[PDB]
Protein backbone atom coordinates (compact mmCIF):
# COMPACT_ATOMS: atom_id res chain seq x y z
CA UNK A 1 0.00 0.00 0.00
CA UNK A 2 2.95 2.29 0.68
CA UNK A 3 6.57 2.50 1.83
CA UNK A 4 8.45 5.72 1.09
CA UNK A 5 8.81 8.52 -1.46
CA UNK A 6 12.04 9.34 -3.30
CA UNK A 7 11.57 12.41 -5.54
CA UNK A 8 12.11 10.81 -9.02
CA UNK A 9 10.99 7.42 -7.70
CA UNK A 10 8.30 6.45 -5.19
CA UNK A 11 8.60 3.31 -3.08
CA UNK A 12 5.27 1.68 -2.24
CA UNK A 13 4.59 -1.74 -0.73
CA UNK A 14 1.49 -3.43 0.70
Amino acid sequence: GSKRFRXPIIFNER
Side-chain angles (χ1 to χ4, degrees):
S2 241
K3 209 73 238 294
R4 215 87 63 84
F5 38 79
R6 281 270 165 288
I9 37 144
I10 65 104
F11 281 114
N12 67 151
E13 211 184 279
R14 266 159 26 204

